[PDB]
mmCIF file of C-alpha atoms and ligand atoms in Angstrom:
data_model
loop_
_atom_site.group_PDB
_atom_site.id
_atom_site.type_symbol
_atom_site.label_atom_id
_atom_site.label_comp_id
_atom_site.label_asym_id
_atom_site.label_seq_id
_atom_site.Cartn_x
_atom_site.Cartn_y
_atom_site.Cartn_z
ATOM 1 C CA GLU W 1 0.000 0.000 0.000
ATOM 2 C CA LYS W 2 1.334 3.424 -1.014
ATOM 3 C CA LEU W 3 -1.747 5.654 -0.430
ATOM 4 C CA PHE W 4 -0.777 6.270 3.209
ATOM 5 C CA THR W 5 2.841 7.244 2.596
ATOM 6 C CA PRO W 6 4.150 10.835 2.539
ATOM 7 C CA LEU W 7 4.687 12.921 -0.587
ATOM 8 C CA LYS W 8 6.548 16.211 -1.053
ATOM 9 C CA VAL W 9 4.188 18.582 -2.920
ATOM 10 C CA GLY W 10 6.125 21.751 -3.709
ATOM 11 C CA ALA W 11 6.546 23.751 -0.476
ATOM 12 C CA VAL W 12 4.665 21.293 1.752
ATOM 13 C CA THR W 13 4.761 17.613 2.627
ATOM 14 C CA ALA W 14 1.528 15.615 2.511
ATOM 15 C CA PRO W 15 1.469 12.723 5.025
ATOM 16 C CA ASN W 16 -0.644 10.623 2.661
ATOM 17 C CA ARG W 17 -1.751 10.610 -0.982
ATOM 18 C CA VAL W 18 -5.514 10.834 -0.390
ATOM 19 C CA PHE W 19 -6.368 14.378 -1.472
ATOM 20 C CA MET W 20 -9.680 16.236 -1.282
ATOM 21 C CA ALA W 21 -10.710 17.400 -4.756
ATOM 22 C CA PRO W 22 -12.015 20.947 -5.266
ATOM 23 C CA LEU W 23 -15.791 20.927 -4.685
ATOM 24 C CA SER W 24 -18.092 23.899 -5.216
ATOM 25 C CA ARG W 25 -20.690 23.672 -2.446
ATOM 26 C CA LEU W 26 -22.200 27.131 -3.076
ATOM 27 C CA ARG W 27 -22.797 28.043 0.578
ATOM 28 C CA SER W 28 -21.019 31.425 0.778
ATOM 29 C CA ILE W 29 -22.657 34.589 2.078
ATOM 30 C CA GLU W 30 -24.182 37.026 -0.378
ATOM 31 C CA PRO W 31 -23.682 39.939 -0.581
ATOM 32 C CA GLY W 32 -19.913 39.737 -0.656
ATOM 33 C CA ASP W 33 -19.296 36.104 -1.720
ATOM 34 C CA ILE W 34 -17.862 35.576 1.772
ATOM 35 C CA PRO W 35 -16.691 32.273 3.279
ATOM 36 C CA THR W 36 -18.500 31.327 6.461
ATOM 37 C CA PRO W 37 -17.781 29.679 9.814
ATOM 38 C CA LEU W 38 -19.847 26.707 8.561
ATOM 39 C CA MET W 39 -17.427 26.371 5.629
ATOM 40 C CA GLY W 40 -14.607 26.591 8.152
ATOM 41 C CA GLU W 41 -16.047 23.658 10.094
ATOM 42 C CA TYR W 42 -16.500 21.570 6.933
ATOM 43 C CA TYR W 43 -12.877 22.030 5.921
ATOM 44 C CA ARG W 44 -11.641 21.481 9.492
ATOM 45 C CA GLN W 45 -13.540 18.157 9.567
ATOM 46 C CA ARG W 46 -11.529 17.052 6.512
ATOM 47 C CA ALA W 47 -8.077 18.218 7.691
ATOM 48 C CA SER W 48 -6.640 14.678 7.803
ATOM 49 C CA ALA W 49 -6.531 14.763 3.982
ATOM 50 C CA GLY W 50 -3.013 14.649 2.492
ATOM 51 C CA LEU W 51 -4.021 17.956 0.925
ATOM 52 C CA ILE W 52 -7.351 19.798 0.815
ATOM 53 C CA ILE W 53 -8.001 21.621 -2.460
ATOM 54 C CA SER W 54 -10.687 24.228 -1.847
ATOM 55 C CA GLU W 55 -13.833 24.869 -3.813
ATOM 56 C CA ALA W 56 -13.328 27.095 -6.849
ATOM 57 C CA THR W 57 -12.829 30.674 -5.687
ATOM 58 C CA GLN W 58 -13.172 33.908 -7.688
ATOM 59 C CA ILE W 59 -10.081 35.924 -8.538
ATOM 60 C CA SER W 60 -12.324 38.982 -9.040
ATOM 61 C CA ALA W 61 -16.018 39.987 -9.030
ATOM 62 C CA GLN W 62 -16.074 39.589 -12.835
ATOM 63 C CA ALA W 63 -14.849 36.000 -12.326
ATOM 64 C CA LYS W 64 -18.138 35.055 -10.651
ATOM 65 C CA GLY W 65 -20.439 32.613 -12.452
ATOM 66 C CA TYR W 66 -22.217 30.807 -9.585
ATOM 67 C CA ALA W 67 -24.275 32.274 -6.751
ATOM 68 C CA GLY W 68 -22.761 31.093 -3.462
ATOM 69 C CA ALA W 69 -19.187 30.603 -4.747
ATOM 70 C CA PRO W 70 -16.619 32.451 -2.653
ATOM 71 C CA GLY W 71 -14.093 35.052 -3.726
ATOM 72 C CA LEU W 72 -10.527 35.931 -2.758
ATOM 73 C CA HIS W 73 -10.448 39.531 -4.025
ATOM 74 C CA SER W 74 -11.960 41.608 -1.160
ATOM 75 C CA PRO W 75 -10.690 42.387 2.339
ATOM 76 C CA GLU W 76 -13.741 40.670 3.881
ATOM 77 C CA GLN W 77 -13.035 37.536 1.857
ATOM 78 C CA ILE W 78 -9.374 37.492 2.829
ATOM 79 C CA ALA W 79 -10.292 37.876 6.520
ATOM 80 C CA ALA W 80 -12.810 35.019 6.307
ATOM 81 C CA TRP W 81 -10.443 32.663 4.461
ATOM 82 C CA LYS W 82 -7.745 33.427 7.067
ATOM 83 C CA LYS W 83 -9.975 31.879 9.711
ATOM 84 C CA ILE W 84 -10.603 28.825 7.528
ATOM 85 C CA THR W 85 -6.922 28.156 6.803
ATOM 86 C CA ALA W 86 -6.110 28.686 10.514
ATOM 87 C CA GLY W 87 -8.667 26.017 11.407
ATOM 88 C CA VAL W 88 -7.182 23.507 8.961
ATOM 89 C CA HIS W 89 -3.686 24.262 10.253
ATOM 90 C CA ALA W 90 -4.855 23.889 13.867
ATOM 91 C CA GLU W 91 -5.644 20.288 12.929
ATOM 92 C CA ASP W 92 -2.237 19.846 11.226
ATOM 93 C CA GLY W 93 -3.757 19.924 7.720
ATOM 94 C CA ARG W 94 -2.684 21.545 4.423
ATOM 95 C CA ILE W 95 -4.948 23.544 2.121
ATOM 96 C CA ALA W 96 -4.713 24.871 -1.430
ATOM 97 C CA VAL W 97 -7.109 27.450 -2.830
ATOM 98 C CA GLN W 98 -8.494 26.700 -6.282
ATOM 99 C CA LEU W 99 -8.671 29.980 -8.195
ATOM 100 C CA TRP W 100 -10.961 30.500 -11.215
ATOM 101 C CA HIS W 101 -12.566 32.845 -13.635
ATOM 102 C CA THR W 102 -15.814 31.282 -14.940
ATOM 103 C CA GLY W 103 -15.781 33.199 -18.221
ATOM 104 C CA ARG W 104 -18.885 32.371 -20.242
ATOM 105 C CA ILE W 105 -20.306 29.902 -17.686
ATOM 106 C CA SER W 106 -22.024 32.744 -15.891
ATOM 107 C CA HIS W 107 -25.108 34.968 -15.950
ATOM 108 C CA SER W 108 -25.448 38.727 -16.337
ATOM 109 C CA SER W 109 -27.433 39.024 -13.076
ATOM 110 C CA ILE W 110 -24.350 38.172 -11.014
ATOM 111 C CA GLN W 111 -21.826 40.181 -13.075
ATOM 112 C CA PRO W 112 -20.665 43.665 -12.128
ATOM 113 C CA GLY W 113 -23.245 46.187 -13.343
ATOM 114 C CA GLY W 114 -25.426 43.304 -14.530
ATOM 115 C CA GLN W 115 -23.569 43.162 -17.846
ATOM 116 C CA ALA W 116 -22.608 40.248 -20.111
ATOM 117 C CA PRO W 117 -19.860 37.919 -18.877
ATOM 118 C CA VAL W 118 -16.574 37.649 -20.791
ATOM 119 C CA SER W 119 -14.775 34.919 -22.730
ATOM 120 C CA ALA W 120 -12.369 34.251 -25.624
ATOM 121 C CA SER W 121 -15.212 34.647 -28.119
ATOM 122 C CA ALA W 122 -18.873 35.737 -28.051
ATOM 123 C CA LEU W 123 -20.724 32.403 -28.370
ATOM 124 C CA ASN W 124 -22.994 31.094 -25.624
ATOM 125 C CA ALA W 125 -21.859 28.073 -23.571
ATOM 126 C CA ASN W 126 -25.345 26.546 -24.081
ATOM 127 C CA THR W 127 -25.440 25.161 -20.570
ATOM 128 C CA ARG W 128 -26.700 26.211 -17.125
ATOM 129 C CA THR W 129 -25.085 27.747 -14.083
ATOM 130 C CA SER W 130 -26.388 27.912 -10.514
ATOM 131 C CA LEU W 131 -27.980 31.084 -9.152
ATOM 132 C CA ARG W 132 -30.113 31.641 -6.046
ATOM 133 C CA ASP W 133 -33.820 32.358 -5.841
ATOM 134 C CA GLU W 134 -35.597 34.958 -3.668
ATOM 135 C CA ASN W 135 -35.268 32.634 -0.629
ATOM 136 C CA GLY W 136 -31.566 31.929 -1.217
ATOM 137 C CA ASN W 137 -31.940 28.396 -2.624
ATOM 138 C CA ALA W 138 -29.822 27.114 -5.537
ATOM 139 C CA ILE W 139 -31.544 27.213 -8.948
ATOM 140 C CA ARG W 140 -30.259 26.308 -12.411
ATOM 141 C CA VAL W 141 -30.395 29.067 -15.051
ATOM 142 C CA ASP W 142 -29.294 29.207 -18.711
ATOM 143 C CA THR W 143 -25.910 30.863 -19.301
ATOM 144 C CA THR W 144 -25.757 34.405 -20.714
ATOM 145 C CA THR W 145 -24.129 35.008 -24.096
ATOM 146 C CA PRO W 146 -20.631 36.372 -23.448
ATOM 147 C CA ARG W 147 -18.671 39.289 -24.861
ATOM 148 C CA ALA W 148 -15.237 38.503 -26.355
ATOM 149 C CA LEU W 149 -12.420 40.036 -24.317
ATOM 150 C CA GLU W 150 -10.701 42.838 -26.176
ATOM 151 C CA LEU W 151 -6.951 42.412 -26.636
ATOM 152 C CA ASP W 152 -6.225 45.288 -24.237
ATOM 153 C CA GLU W 153 -8.266 43.568 -21.495
ATOM 154 C CA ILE W 154 -6.009 40.474 -21.388
ATOM 155 C CA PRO W 155 -3.302 41.989 -19.164
ATOM 156 C CA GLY W 156 -5.981 42.806 -16.561
ATOM 157 C CA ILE W 157 -7.070 39.153 -16.444
ATOM 158 C CA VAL W 158 -3.466 38.064 -15.870
ATOM 159 C CA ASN W 159 -3.169 40.725 -13.143
ATOM 160 C CA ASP W 160 -6.349 39.496 -11.445
ATOM 161 C CA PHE W 161 -4.870 35.986 -11.167
ATOM 162 C CA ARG W 162 -1.610 37.517 -9.888
ATOM 163 C CA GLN W 163 -3.393 39.586 -7.256
ATOM 164 C CA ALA W 164 -5.566 36.662 -6.141
ATOM 165 C CA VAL W 165 -2.400 34.589 -5.571
ATOM 166 C CA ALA W 166 -0.896 37.441 -3.525
ATOM 167 C CA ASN W 167 -4.128 37.410 -1.531
ATOM 168 C CA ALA W 168 -4.011 33.606 -1.129
ATOM 169 C CA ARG W 169 -0.541 33.924 0.426
ATOM 170 C CA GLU W 170 -1.760 36.520 2.941
ATOM 171 C CA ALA W 171 -4.823 34.383 3.707
ATOM 172 C CA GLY W 172 -2.583 31.519 4.835
ATOM 173 C CA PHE W 173 -3.098 29.015 2.030
ATOM 174 C CA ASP W 174 -0.279 26.504 1.533
ATOM 175 C CA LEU W 175 -0.642 26.322 -2.245
ATOM 176 C CA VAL W 176 -2.789 27.650 -5.072
ATOM 177 C CA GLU W 177 -4.454 25.607 -7.819
ATOM 178 C CA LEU W 178 -5.160 27.400 -11.096
ATOM 179 C CA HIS W 179 -8.497 26.234 -12.523
ATOM 180 C CA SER W 180 -7.566 25.543 -16.139
ATOM 181 C CA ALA W 181 -10.212 22.821 -16.556
ATOM 182 C CA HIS W 182 -13.914 22.104 -17.036
ATOM 183 C CA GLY W 183 -14.713 24.745 -19.627
ATOM 184 C CA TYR W 184 -14.038 27.810 -17.444
ATOM 185 C CA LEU W 185 -12.116 30.868 -18.678
ATOM 186 C CA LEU W 186 -8.611 29.451 -19.077
ATOM 187 C CA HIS W 187 -9.980 26.308 -20.765
ATOM 188 C CA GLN W 188 -12.223 28.477 -22.975
ATOM 189 C CA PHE W 189 -9.031 29.944 -24.429
ATOM 190 C CA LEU W 190 -7.314 26.528 -24.613
ATOM 191 C CA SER W 191 -10.045 24.817 -26.636
ATOM 192 C CA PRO W 192 -10.547 25.534 -30.347
ATOM 193 C CA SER W 193 -14.296 24.866 -29.906
ATOM 194 C CA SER W 194 -14.665 27.928 -27.664
ATOM 195 C CA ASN W 195 -11.921 30.102 -29.146
ATOM 196 C CA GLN W 196 -12.324 31.616 -32.621
ATOM 197 C CA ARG W 197 -9.919 34.518 -31.991
ATOM 198 C CA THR W 198 -7.750 35.795 -34.846
ATOM 199 C CA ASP W 199 -5.217 37.630 -32.647
ATOM 200 C CA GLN W 200 -2.273 35.982 -30.885
ATOM 201 C CA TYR W 201 -4.654 34.360 -28.342
ATOM 202 C CA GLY W 202 -6.365 32.089 -30.872
ATOM 203 C CA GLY W 203 -5.533 29.669 -33.677
ATOM 204 C CA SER W 204 -2.465 27.532 -33.005
ATOM 205 C CA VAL W 205 -2.059 25.594 -29.758
ATOM 206 C CA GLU W 206 0.745 28.035 -28.884
ATOM 207 C CA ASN W 207 -1.722 30.921 -29.170
ATOM 208 C CA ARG W 208 -4.530 29.056 -27.362
ATOM 209 C CA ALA W 209 -2.199 28.205 -24.435
ATOM 210 C CA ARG W 210 -0.723 31.717 -24.354
ATOM 211 C CA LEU W 211 -3.107 33.022 -21.685
ATOM 212 C CA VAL W 212 -2.780 30.161 -19.195
ATOM 213 C CA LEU W 213 1.023 30.257 -19.517
ATOM 214 C CA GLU W 214 1.063 34.044 -18.958
ATOM 215 C CA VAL W 215 -0.972 33.389 -15.821
ATOM 216 C CA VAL W 216 1.407 30.622 -14.644
ATOM 217 C CA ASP W 217 4.417 32.923 -15.161
ATOM 218 C CA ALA W 218 2.716 35.813 -13.348
ATOM 219 C CA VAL W 219 1.773 33.740 -10.303
ATOM 220 C CA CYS W 220 5.159 31.993 -10.062
ATOM 221 C CA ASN W 221 6.757 35.444 -10.079
ATOM 222 C CA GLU W 222 4.323 36.852 -7.510
ATOM 223 C CA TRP W 223 4.852 34.017 -5.044
ATOM 224 C CA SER W 224 7.025 30.964 -5.880
ATOM 225 C CA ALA W 225 6.789 28.078 -8.404
ATOM 226 C CA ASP W 226 6.709 25.563 -5.550
ATOM 227 C CA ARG W 227 3.413 27.149 -4.395
ATOM 228 C CA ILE W 228 1.594 26.724 -7.721
ATOM 229 C CA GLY W 229 -0.516 23.835 -8.975
ATOM 230 C CA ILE W 230 -2.803 23.685 -11.983
ATOM 231 C CA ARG W 231 -5.879 21.627 -12.809
ATOM 232 C CA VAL W 232 -6.368 20.660 -16.443
ATOM 233 C CA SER W 233 -8.970 18.489 -18.204
ATOM 234 C CA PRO W 234 -7.313 18.241 -21.623
ATOM 235 C CA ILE W 235 -8.766 14.927 -22.904
ATOM 236 C CA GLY W 236 -12.493 14.577 -23.582
ATOM 237 C CA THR W 237 -15.488 16.907 -23.441
ATOM 238 C CA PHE W 238 -16.425 19.066 -20.419
ATOM 239 C CA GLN W 239 -19.469 21.287 -20.008
ATOM 240 C CA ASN W 240 -19.768 21.457 -23.837
ATOM 241 C CA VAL W 241 -16.091 22.427 -24.191
ATOM 242 C CA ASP W 242 -14.230 19.654 -25.991
ATOM 243 C CA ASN W 243 -10.452 19.722 -26.500
ATOM 244 C CA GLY W 244 -10.335 19.809 -30.291
ATOM 245 C CA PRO W 245 -9.142 17.370 -32.969
ATOM 246 C CA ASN W 246 -5.531 17.096 -31.723
ATOM 247 C CA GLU W 247 -6.291 16.851 -28.023
ATOM 248 C CA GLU W 248 -3.411 14.522 -27.078
ATOM 249 C CA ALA W 249 -0.687 16.443 -28.954
ATOM 250 C CA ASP W 250 -2.040 19.751 -27.628
ATOM 251 C CA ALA W 251 -2.129 18.364 -24.059
ATOM 252 C CA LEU W 252 1.507 17.262 -24.262
ATOM 253 C CA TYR W 253 2.514 20.698 -25.598
ATOM 254 C CA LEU W 254 0.840 22.385 -22.624
ATOM 255 C CA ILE W 255 2.337 19.937 -20.097
ATOM 256 C CA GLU W 256 5.842 20.420 -21.543
ATOM 257 C CA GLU W 257 5.414 24.174 -21.204
ATOM 258 C CA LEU W 258 4.140 23.883 -17.628
ATOM 259 C CA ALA W 259 7.139 21.696 -16.768
ATOM 260 C CA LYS W 260 9.545 24.499 -17.745
ATOM 261 C CA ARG W 261 8.166 26.631 -14.901
ATOM 262 C CA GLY W 262 8.949 23.991 -12.245
ATOM 263 C CA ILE W 263 5.530 24.223 -10.629
ATOM 264 C CA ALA W 264 4.435 22.116 -7.655
ATOM 265 C CA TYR W 265 1.874 19.919 -9.339
ATOM 266 C CA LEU W 266 -0.248 18.906 -12.286
ATOM 267 C CA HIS W 267 -3.819 17.859 -11.397
ATOM 268 C CA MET W 268 -5.570 15.968 -14.196
ATOM 269 C CA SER W 269 -9.356 15.804 -14.182
ATOM 270 C CA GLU W 270 -9.700 12.765 -16.396
ATOM 271 C CA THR W 271 -13.444 12.699 -17.035
ATOM 272 C CA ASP W 272 -16.513 14.882 -16.527
ATOM 273 C CA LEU W 273 -19.117 13.546 -14.101
ATOM 274 C CA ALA W 274 -20.997 12.048 -17.100
ATOM 275 C CA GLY W 275 -17.965 9.905 -18.007
ATOM 276 C CA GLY W 276 -15.497 9.600 -20.860
ATOM 277 C CA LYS W 277 -12.860 7.417 -22.498
ATOM 278 C CA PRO W 278 -10.179 6.240 -20.031
ATOM 279 C CA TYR W 279 -6.595 7.504 -20.171
ATOM 280 C CA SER W 280 -4.299 4.946 -21.809
ATOM 281 C CA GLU W 281 -1.133 3.914 -19.948
ATOM 282 C CA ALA W 282 0.786 5.085 -23.034
ATOM 283 C CA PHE W 283 -0.666 8.596 -22.632
ATOM 284 C CA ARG W 284 -0.012 8.536 -18.881
ATOM 285 C CA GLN W 285 3.641 7.640 -19.629
ATOM 286 C CA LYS W 286 3.872 10.505 -22.116
ATOM 287 C CA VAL W 287 2.549 12.873 -19.427
ATOM 288 C CA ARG W 288 4.834 11.424 -16.762
ATOM 289 C CA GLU W 289 8.020 11.878 -18.817
ATOM 290 C CA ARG W 290 7.168 15.549 -19.517
ATOM 291 C CA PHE W 291 6.262 16.749 -16.019
ATOM 292 C CA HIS W 292 8.757 16.487 -13.151
ATOM 293 C CA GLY W 293 6.543 17.467 -10.249
ATOM 294 C CA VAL W 294 3.677 15.757 -8.516
ATOM 295 C CA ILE W 295 0.870 14.394 -10.705
ATOM 296 C CA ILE W 296 -2.587 14.096 -9.147
ATOM 297 C CA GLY W 297 -5.193 11.889 -10.825
ATOM 298 C CA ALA W 298 -8.924 12.507 -10.448
ATOM 299 C CA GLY W 299 -12.284 11.292 -11.696
ATOM 300 C CA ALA W 300 -14.256 8.369 -10.281
ATOM 301 C CA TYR W 301 -11.142 6.853 -8.715
ATOM 302 C CA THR W 302 -11.262 3.995 -6.288
ATOM 303 C CA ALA W 303 -8.488 3.286 -3.780
ATOM 304 C CA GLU W 304 -7.741 0.203 -5.905
ATOM 305 C CA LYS W 305 -7.198 2.269 -9.060
ATOM 306 C CA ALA W 306 -5.152 4.830 -7.113
ATOM 307 C CA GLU W 307 -2.897 2.095 -5.709
ATOM 308 C CA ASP W 308 -2.498 0.521 -9.168
ATOM 309 C CA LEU W 309 -1.417 3.752 -10.856
ATOM 310 C CA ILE W 310 0.733 5.010 -7.968
ATOM 311 C CA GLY W 311 2.383 1.562 -7.883
ATOM 312 C CA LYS W 312 3.081 1.791 -11.632
ATOM 313 C CA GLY W 313 4.759 5.200 -11.059
ATOM 314 C CA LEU W 314 2.301 7.000 -13.367
ATOM 315 C CA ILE W 315 0.698 9.292 -10.761
ATOM 316 C CA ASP W 316 1.681 10.349 -7.220
ATOM 317 C CA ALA W 317 -1.643 11.112 -5.546
ATOM 318 C CA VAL W 318 -5.395 10.891 -6.085
ATOM 319 C CA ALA W 319 -8.047 13.551 -5.461
ATOM 320 C CA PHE W 320 -11.416 12.214 -4.348
ATOM 321 C CA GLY W 321 -14.456 14.450 -4.718
ATOM 322 C CA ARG W 322 -17.778 12.891 -3.826
ATOM 323 C CA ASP W 323 -16.265 10.401 -1.374
ATOM 324 C CA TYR W 324 -14.859 13.443 0.490
ATOM 325 C CA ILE W 325 -18.261 15.153 0.521
ATOM 326 C CA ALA W 326 -19.642 12.154 2.352
ATOM 327 C CA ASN W 327 -16.636 11.054 4.462
ATOM 328 C CA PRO W 328 -14.729 13.665 6.436
ATOM 329 C CA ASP W 329 -12.344 10.952 7.657
ATOM 330 C CA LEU W 330 -11.934 9.323 4.260
ATOM 331 C CA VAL W 331 -8.238 8.697 4.959
ATOM 332 C CA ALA W 332 -8.971 6.615 8.091
ATOM 333 C CA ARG W 333 -11.798 4.753 6.339
ATOM 334 C CA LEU W 334 -9.647 3.795 3.354
ATOM 335 C CA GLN W 335 -6.769 2.851 5.663
ATOM 336 C CA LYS W 336 -9.016 0.593 7.783
ATOM 337 C CA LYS W 337 -11.097 -0.656 4.822
ATOM 338 C CA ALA W 338 -14.222 0.618 6.589
ATOM 339 C CA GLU W 339 -17.539 1.246 4.865
ATOM 340 C CA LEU W 340 -18.262 4.743 3.591
ATOM 341 C CA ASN W 341 -21.231 6.957 4.429
ATOM 342 C CA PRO W 342 -23.833 7.062 1.656
ATOM 343 C CA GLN W 343 -23.868 10.188 -0.523
ATOM 344 C CA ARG W 344 -26.823 12.585 -0.511
ATOM 345 C CA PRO W 345 -26.534 14.415 -3.867
ATOM 346 C CA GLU W 346 -29.547 16.659 -3.282
ATOM 347 C CA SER W 347 -27.487 18.665 -0.782
ATOM 348 C CA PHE W 348 -24.264 18.921 -2.830
ATOM 349 C CA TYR W 349 -25.137 22.518 -3.850
ATOM 350 C CA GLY W 350 -26.450 25.338 -1.680
ATOM 351 C CA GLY W 351 -28.347 25.048 1.583
ATOM 352 C CA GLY W 352 -26.755 24.813 5.003
ATOM 353 C CA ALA W 353 -25.338 22.299 7.444
ATOM 354 C CA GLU W 354 -27.517 19.431 6.258
ATOM 355 C CA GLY W 355 -25.577 17.404 3.693
ATOM 356 C CA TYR W 356 -22.457 19.434 4.492
ATOM 357 C CA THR W 357 -21.170 19.058 8.059
ATOM 358 C CA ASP W 358 -23.514 16.229 9.188
ATOM 359 C CA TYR W 359 -21.719 13.272 7.586
ATOM 360 C CA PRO W 360 -20.209 11.563 10.630
ATOM 361 C CA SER W 361 -16.646 10.438 11.221
ATOM 362 C CA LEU W 362 -15.999 6.937 12.537
HETATM 363 C C1 FMN F 1 -20.631 18.974 -6.035
HETATM 364 C C2 FMN F 1 -19.392 19.048 -6.906
HETATM 365 C C3 FMN F 1 -18.690 20.244 -7.030
HETATM 366 C C4 FMN F 1 -17.553 20.329 -7.832
HETATM 367 N N1 FMN F 1 -16.873 21.507 -7.864
HETATM 368 C C5 FMN F 1 -15.660 21.566 -8.495
HETATM 369 C C6 FMN F 1 -14.828 22.707 -8.408
HETATM 370 O O1 FMN F 1 -15.140 23.713 -7.722
HETATM 371 N N2 FMN F 1 -13.658 22.705 -9.084
HETATM 372 C C7 FMN F 1 -13.263 21.633 -9.828
HETATM 373 O O2 FMN F 1 -12.173 21.675 -10.454
HETATM 374 N N3 FMN F 1 -14.034 20.517 -9.901
HETATM 375 C C8 FMN F 1 -15.215 20.455 -9.239
HETATM 376 N N4 FMN F 1 -15.941 19.316 -9.291
HETATM 377 C C9 FMN F 1 -15.269 18.108 -9.812
HETATM 378 C C10 FMN F 1 -14.578 17.305 -8.702
HETATM 379 O O3 FMN F 1 -13.404 18.008 -8.243
HETATM 380 C C11 FMN F 1 -14.178 15.906 -9.178
HETATM 381 O O4 FMN F 1 -13.266 16.061 -10.281
HETATM 382 C C12 FMN F 1 -15.381 15.040 -9.586
HETATM 383 O O5 FMN F 1 -16.327 15.015 -8.518
HETATM 384 C C13 FMN F 1 -15.014 13.605 -9.957
HETATM 385 O O6 FMN F 1 -14.317 12.962 -8.894
HETATM 386 P P1 FMN F 1 -15.073 11.925 -7.887
HETATM 387 O O7 FMN F 1 -15.571 10.782 -8.725
HETATM 388 O O8 FMN F 1 -13.956 11.544 -6.938
HETATM 389 O O9 FMN F 1 -16.197 12.695 -7.227
HETATM 390 C C14 FMN F 1 -17.070 19.207 -8.521
HETATM 391 C C15 FMN F 1 -17.782 18.001 -8.393
HETATM 392 C C16 FMN F 1 -18.931 17.931 -7.600
HETATM 393 C C17 FMN F 1 -19.667 16.617 -7.484
#
């Protein structure tokens, strides 16, 4: 068994390889998109994880696409996150903040000034996001057609990521995870399906990856490379964003570029919740030989699959999502081979303590 052995992950050392995947639970305070003491308790309950990766967190107000998702741009948000990271650290845990811009997966009603959200191009995502109704309950609503970012707006986006990472450091996070997956802003630029730009930020894979790599360079400079992770989902289709006709070659280009920056980790979201074709061992080997930091696998993993791939030297750790929703002490349960609590999907998004902090530990 290798799941319960330590792993150096950039600036910190995880005592085990059972990581908590980033999970939007949409329970923040509005107005202000502010983390809450209840969120603090939820994360504290899970502090035995090798590493906690937080729910996706806005780099800016414009970044917002979901009602109830927290930010890390305002003083009030920084102060609230400080309490949450202190709680995790009080229990000898480690926590990374996942930072995103939702781009076109958003709605005008939650944008600054109530205006259209932004993206690489001006075509609708043709999906839904989650807002709140008049009583504060999560509701699904069709995405608003975006405006294409103007070329002179791109530096501001890079700066917003940079500033959010500065803020993450002050808030006491151990690492940051850039959300470059699942059809959100960075992935919108990466994918040819969502990027029809004719400037240097569209066309070739070099142009499509230009933005995410500018962001990686900015955040490594702001803090340190050993503090930076990135989540990608470069094979398959996610939230209507596929990865184009040369997805494998384009993925390896991006991974080679990321490797040059010497960042802490590469987190691969292998499938959407609806499923997809499995990664081949050949492709995993091609990834492994290009990236010289920690590789985290994710997507419907079992402990058995995690052990198999860690044992083969293809990944270093596994992030569990839904099992972590339902099992605060997932590490102890997997170590002891104990049964897991049943999941209650109706309370994954929005609401309060029920379905959030009421899954018991052993
Ligand atoms: C309720 C819920 C919220 C999620 N929120 C995020 C998120 O904020 N960021 C992210 O990268 N992935 C998010 N995902 C994807 C998970 O991180 C994970 O990749 C997915 O649940 C598959 O892994 P699992 O089979 O271990 O649950 C979310 C998944 C669920 C079920």
